[PDB]
Amino acid sequence: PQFSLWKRPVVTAYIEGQPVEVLLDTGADDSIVAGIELGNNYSPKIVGGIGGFINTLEYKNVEIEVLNKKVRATIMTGDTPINIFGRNILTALGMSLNL
Amino acid sequence: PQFSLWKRPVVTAYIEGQPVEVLLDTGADDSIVAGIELGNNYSPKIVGGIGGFINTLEYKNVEIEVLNKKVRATIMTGDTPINIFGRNILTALGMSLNL
Numbered sequence A, B: 001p002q003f004s005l006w007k008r009p010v011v012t013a014y015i016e017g018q019p020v021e022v023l024l025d026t027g028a029d030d031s032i033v034a035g036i037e038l039g040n041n042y043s044p045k046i047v048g049g050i051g052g053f054i055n056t057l058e059y060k061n062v063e064i065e066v067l068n069k070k071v072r073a074t075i076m077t078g079d080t081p082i083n084i085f086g087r088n089i090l091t092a093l094g095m096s097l098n099l
């Protein structure tokens, strides 16, 4: 692949067969997605940004599959208008930011 | 070339000659730098983030030098918990997200 940033990096990933449309965010440290069943083994946490805090639920070791690559990362469940795939996943996907 | 997302993408930049430390955020439409005086040619704007919406003072055609590039882009001042260089500078700088 290769992504020009004239339009937000929007991709389709699978959070265990569950298709979701996620944003390629080099600025997030963690990743958040909505309306996903990930089970009962979660870690309650709050995250802060611009505008304040939100409560998520951390699920470690969730297998994902994006851009023809399979990764096993950590995702949290919070309510966001848009799902984010921060660096935890980008670094795993083997993603870089070039010039 | 490329770079890694292991390292959180933090850089130093001169925002109209003030060295400012910023975060290369390819999941941000805009540029929000906190506590800097840019003048009187503003225009209040509204930016949305994860935790909510913050009120900002919009400054256009601001002179920016980052990663050894001179570029003039719209800078937004505000209450961001962290200074970000949105995709509006990422297009300008000619950056792309590769895999």
Ligand SMILES: CC(C)[C@H](C[C@H](O)[C@H](CC1CCCCC1)NC(=O)[C@H](CC(N)=O)NC(=O)c1ccc2ccccc2n1)C(=O)NCC(C)(C)C
Residues within 6 Å of the ligand: A025, A027, A028, A029, A030, A031, A032, A047, A048, A049, A050, A080, A081, A082, A084, A086, B023, B025, B027, B028, B029, B030, B031, B032, B047, B048, B049, B050, B081, B082, B084, B086
């Ligand atoms: C503050 C930083 C460092 C980082 C912010 C992200 O890059 C972050 C991710 C999401 C984008 C979509 C809406 C949810 C938040 N981006 C942003 O906060 C940028 C800032 C900007 N205006 O340039 N926001 C936006 O680009 C943006 C526009 C669409 C929106 C629609 C509705 C509500 C909010 C919206 N925010 C962050 O908060 N990380 C923590 C994490 C991953 C838990 C959010």
